[PDB]
Design a protein around this motif. Structure first.
Motif, PDB file in Angstrom:
ATOM      1  N   UNK A  76       5.771  -4.616  -1.304  1.00  0.00           N
ATOM      2  CA  UNK A  76       4.875  -5.653  -0.317  1.00  0.00           C
ATOM      3  C   UNK A  76       6.098  -6.709   0.378  1.00  0.00           C
ATOM      4  N   UNK A 130      13.103  10.132  -7.580  1.00  0.00           N
ATOM      5  CA  UNK A 130      12.339   9.103  -6.405  1.00  0.00           C
ATOM      6  C   UNK A 130      11.408   9.399  -4.854  1.00  0.00           C
ATOM      7  N   UNK A 131      10.655   8.937  -4.637  1.00  0.00           N
ATOM      8  CA  UNK A 131      10.209   8.778  -2.998  1.00  0.00           C
ATOM      9  C   UNK A 131       8.988   8.262  -3.045  1.00  0.00           C
ATOM     10  N   UNK A 132       9.300   7.012  -1.588  1.00  0.00           N
ATOM     11  CA  UNK A 132       8.342   6.572  -1.228  1.00  0.00           C
ATOM     12  C   UNK A 132       7.327   7.556  -0.734  1.00  0.00           C
ATOM     13  N   UNK A 186       2.747   7.759   0.117  1.00  0.00           N
ATOM     14  CA  UNK A 186       1.085   7.169   0.490  1.00  0.00           C
ATOM     15  C   UNK A 186       0.462   7.752  -0.167  1.00  0.00           C
ATOM     16  N   UNK A 220       2.519   1.636   0.546  1.00  0.00           N
ATOM     17  CA  UNK A 220       3.359   2.671   0.076  1.00  0.00           C
ATOM     18  C   UNK A 220       3.353   2.221  -1.751  1.00  0.00           C
ATOM     19  N   UNK A 225      16.909 -11.770  10.329  1.00  0.00           N
ATOM     20  CA  UNK A 225      17.579 -10.868  11.294  1.00  0.00           C
ATOM     21  C   UNK A 225      16.831 -11.755  12.730  1.00  0.00           C
ATOM     22  N   UNK A 268      14.734  -6.257   6.889  1.00  0.00           N
ATOM     23  CA  UNK A 268      14.285  -4.925   7.553  1.00  0.00           C
ATOM     24  C   UNK A 268      12.901  -3.787   6.286  1.00  0.00           C
ATOM     25  N   UNK A 292      11.327  -1.127   4.351  1.00  0.00           N
ATOM     26  CA  UNK A 292      11.770   0.857   4.303  1.00  0.00           C
ATOM     27  C   UNK A 292      10.389   1.653   4.034  1.00  0.00           C
ATOM     28  N   UNK A 293      10.688   2.724   4.807  1.00  0.00           N
ATOM     29  CA  UNK A 293       9.639   3.520   5.933  1.00  0.00           C
ATOM     30  C   UNK A 293       9.792   4.699   5.486  1.00  0.00           C
ATOM     31  N   UNK A 294      10.747   5.269   4.141  1.00  0.00           N
ATOM     32  CA  UNK A 294      10.901   6.888   3.599  1.00  0.00           C
ATOM     33  C   UNK A 294      12.248   6.524   3.158  1.00  0.00           C
ATOM     34  N   UNK A 295      11.954   7.197   1.516  1.00  0.00           N
ATOM     35  CA  UNK A 295      13.490   6.950   0.506  1.00  0.00           C
ATOM     36  C   UNK A 295      13.046   8.168  -0.419  1.00  0.00           C
ATOM     37  N   UNK A 305       5.951   6.504   5.981  1.00  0.00           N
ATOM     38  CA  UNK A 305       5.465   5.906   6.049  1.00  0.00           C
ATOM     39  C   UNK A 305       4.384   4.695   6.412  1.00  0.00           C
ATOM     40  N   UNK A 354       3.522   1.382   7.188  1.00  0.00           N
ATOM     41  CA  UNK A 354       2.546   0.443   6.748  1.00  0.00           C
ATOM     42  C   UNK A 354       2.938  -1.338   7.897  1.00  0.00           C
ATOM     43  N   UNK A 355       2.437  -2.474   7.137  1.00  0.00           N
ATOM     44  CA  UNK A 355       2.235  -3.671   7.820  1.00  0.00           C
ATOM     45  C   UNK A 355       3.233  -4.439   6.587  1.00  0.00           C
ATOM     46  N   UNK A 356       4.231  -5.223   6.906  1.00  0.00           N
ATOM     47  CA  UNK A 356       5.148  -5.624   5.898  1.00  0.00           C
ATOM     48  C   UNK A 356       3.936  -7.527   5.990  1.00  0.00           C
TER      49      UNK A 356
END
Ligand SMILES: O=c1[nH]cnc2c1ncn2[C@@H]1O[C@H](COP(=O)(O)OP(=O)(O)O)[C@@H](O)[C@H]1O
Ligand SMILES: O=c1[nH]cnc2c1ncn2[C@@H]1O[C@H](COP(=O)(O)OP(=O)(O)O)[C@@H](O)[C@H]1O
Ligand SMILES: O=c1[nH]cnc2c1ncn2[C@@H]1O[C@H](COP(=O)(O)OP(=O)(O)O)[C@@H](O)[C@H]1O
Ligand SMILES: O=c1[nH]cnc2c1ncn2[C@@H]1O[C@H](COP(=O)(O)OP(=O)(O)O)[C@@H](O)[C@H]1O
Ligand SMILES: O=c1[nH]cnc2c1ncn2[C@@H]1O[C@H](COP(=O)(O)OP(=O)(O)O)[C@@H](O)[C@H]1O
Ligand SMILES: O=c1[nH]cnc2c1ncn2[C@@H]1O[C@H](COP(=O)(O)OP(=O)(O)O)[C@@H](O)[C@H]1O
Ligand SMILES: [Mg+2]
Ligand SMILES: [Mg+2]
Ligand SMILES: [Mg+2]
Ligand SMILES: [Mg+2]
Ligand SMILES: [Mg+2]
Ligand SMILES: [Mg+2]
Lengths: 153, 153, 153, 153, 153, 153
Positions: free
Chosen positions: A17, A38-40, A42, A72, C110, D33, D35-38, D140, D142-144
């Motif tokens: 966050x 490595x992986x993001x 939840x 996450x 942004x 930006x 990060x929603x997947x990695x 994933x 989520x809300x920043x």
């Protein structure tokens, strides 16, 4: 100590966050350790309670699990000589109040309930945590181009 | 230790002259402390003598006051849990020769008479120094968007 | 162009909230400009509407004023040769979508409604904004130790 | 342009080998930006051929696929307003010789065959590449905590 | 005690190969020490055995000399008060396993046989190594523009 | 086109005085270019008038030569594909007023008479300046451990 020792490092939801994914990875990257998984993710509550199973009697257990579920997590496996012990030194003391500047928690954290990151405390716990969080095929086998410049043998 | 503890941090004239305003602010900003007051000032001699009143009989007192008058000072109030003690840790030992790399003085300073920064050494001295350098109207009340990620509820 | 030209740079509430005070100051500091005034302020609505008086007919005016009121602002006066024009180049395009990486907005922003920072667009507007935000005694007169290494004459 | 647009960013094997995972992630992270997947992956040859299917008849196709198989890849999905176009701007020109300092390739790369990173060139190609590299469960939601400071309501 | 004290700092071939010349120089530069001599050299085996003459009976002597011959070396002379002892503190413990984060070896090294850098351990040995690596004409005489802000003298 | 192309990069006395040796070297190091020669020198006035011989009739020639004599110079030779042209792009425009943020002069310089750095403007002039500043023995022959990851050759 073997250069193929592995440890489990996780960026906790407060680290994600607060925008600390890049800096934390750079700490282990610049030190010379090898990122092998490595992986993001939840993860479900059951996995987090098993991860912290030894703390199930602590009064802060339920708050710890709820906070680990609140965002996450960047789960990582790092490989290198004494990466477990040195990884803990890079993270700093569990309570950031006792951590030294130059460590991750010494640079980025204040509260022990919000210490940004997790690291395996022992080689055997590292093996258990890696198997808990990662499938075998998620660990990537590769050889760094600067391996012979980081290690003597 | 409540999260609203406040300390007085000041970048001394040598820190301003050497272009260290940005880096020093980032040390506290990245750690998670809240900036509640800041101003660039060239305060009067009597204010600097009162700031260092406990050292009035030290042989370096007149030299310290004169050097603190030789350039602008970036005065700051930072707020956070144990910000007084942790602030002193971030600054490093008073003598930079005894400071550790990773602290402000351990990264940027050499001479004790030019240790680039100042920090309150106790909560009661912080309240004194805040009242000496800042009018109450200069402290800004606000809530950090990441407060609940820096501190546990 | 004279080396004592001044411009007004302000870190908007989104820049303060997102922890960008240190980095933004470092951009102007490392470039060689001189910080002559700075203060964290929460200015009243009347001052912000006068600051943006030329945009009072724009449809985004009321949202701009409300957002400028929503958090603290780091108001600054920087001095240097062509600091107005070069300051605008350092900040980047007003809309961050059109800004180039390496500028402040190209690295950190942004949305045009959340462009982190403000900079005077002309020398005459700079003089007006400086007088609006700062009292004369808040501008500090000093000489940088590296003045002769930044400027030829 | 909605704030939930997504793009596929991948650190190529040369970027991983040269220790650029941290710095590249920080470029997108600092910009605002999400990060929603990695995941770190060594994908099969057929996946890399489908990724570059539009270049199957280019003379460098077989060399490109073989080099993309020569090491691990850090695959990422980033979410934000105009993240596809702005992502390409952050990466810099495809040929690093034409890229500008301040971009990823302008700071870190030289040869077009070793441009350290990849980014989707359009929204429709982003959706294709996201579906090719990531299972839907790996993204994933989520809300920043700073979403309302990055974007105007 | 004397601000004209000098020490010999060398970036070993592993530090050159891993692209650490810039960061290492910045550590001493930002601290306030003065660079008075520097050159990239590939010294003969006879000079390196002179440099490590006191370790000729160690079992790692042959491997150390061979590794010091395997790449270029950035030889440097830094000048400042207590630069010998403080220089060693900046480098960190000889074995990076024992070094602290925030030092050079604590940020960048893992193996004692690949500790990236070398620093003189005493003033007398510093004078010996400076005469071994540098000719007297190669030490440049100059005075820093911020000398009076680094030292109280 | 050839990866063994070399250029002459010099850190001018204002860059040395302002503590920019580290950051400047890092720009070329991180880009992937190879340092093959470096030395801190204080060359005589006759050599500097040779270096700027084509500007002997310019009205700023005398001031330029005097300023180049006012402090130490970090002379360097960097090797890489199109390192002459790309090196100039990294430095930025000769007049920092016209340079872009993200370049060396765009991040650190203001006046054209104090542009911190010098770079060869052509391959032929690079060969001339390398022979003027360096002896042939001072150019070190080595191969980077990540050469095959920087170049597709
Ligand atoms: O006293 C506490 N209050 C709230 N959270 C705690 C406390 N002690 C530990 N924790 C949290 O539980 C996590 C695991 O605790 P542990 O004892 O295993 O230390 P470790 O994380 O360094 O291995 C800690 O990182 C911290 O986030
Ligand atoms: O022995 C000395 N010679 C010159 N200046 C000193 C000496 N001792 C302390 N100072 C300066 O006075 C300031 C205040 O002294 P103090 O004992 O309160 O240390 P502190 O700043 O950590 O609280 C120091 O920061 C330092 O700049
Ligand atoms: O179209 C818009 N929608 C929302 N805010 C805008 C818009 N255009 C400009 N702004 C905001 O008003 C501020 C002042 O606008 P101005 O036209 O003076 O550009 P400037 O800030 O670069 O001088 C801008 O920085 C921006 O925050
Ligand atoms: O001419 C070439 N020789 C070797 N590799 C190339 C060449 N042109 C493009 N590539 C590589 O193929 C990748 C994809 O090509 P594309 O045209 O889609 O550029 P892009 O990555 O910016 O979308 C490039 O990133 C580059 O690594
Ligand atoms: O046990 C060892 N195995 C391999 N190399 C060693 C060992 N001990 C020291 N070295 C290497 O020899 C160099 C010089 O040894 P020394 O005892 O003087 O430490 P120092 O560099 O801190 O002065 C060290 O920097 C290190 O690279
Ligand atoms: O108009 C001027 N006034 C003062 N110095 C100048 C001026 N023009 C160029 N210089 C200085 O002379 C140096 C060499 O001039 P040149 O025309 O070759 O530019 P270059 O360094 O980019 O090749 C420049 O780097 C600059 O420091
Ligand atoms: Mg535990
Ligand atoms: Mg005191
Ligand atoms: Mg305007
Ligand atoms: Mg394509
Ligand atoms: Mg020794
Ligand atoms: Mg020229």
């Amino acid at each position: 100590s073997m250069s193929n020792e592995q440890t489990f490092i996780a960026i906790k939801p407060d680290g994600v966050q607060r925008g600390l994914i890049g800096p934390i990875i750079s700490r282990f990257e610049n030190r010379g350790f090898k990122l092998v998984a490595m992986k993001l993710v939840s993860p479900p509550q059951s996995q987090l309670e098993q991860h912290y199973a030894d703390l199930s009697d602590k009064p802060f257990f339920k708050g710890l699990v709820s906070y680990m579920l609140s965002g996450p997590i960047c789960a990582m496996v790092w490989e290198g000589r004494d990466v477990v012990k040195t990884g803990r030194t890079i993270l700093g003391a569990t309570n950031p109040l006792a951590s030294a500047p130059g460590t991750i928690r010494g640079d980025f954290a204040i509260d022990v309930g919000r210490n940004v990151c997790h690291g395996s405390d022992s080689v055997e716990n590292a093996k258990k945590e890696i198997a808990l969080w990662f499938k075998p095929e998620e660990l990537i086998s590769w050889k760094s181009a600067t391996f012979d410049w980081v290690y003597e043998k």
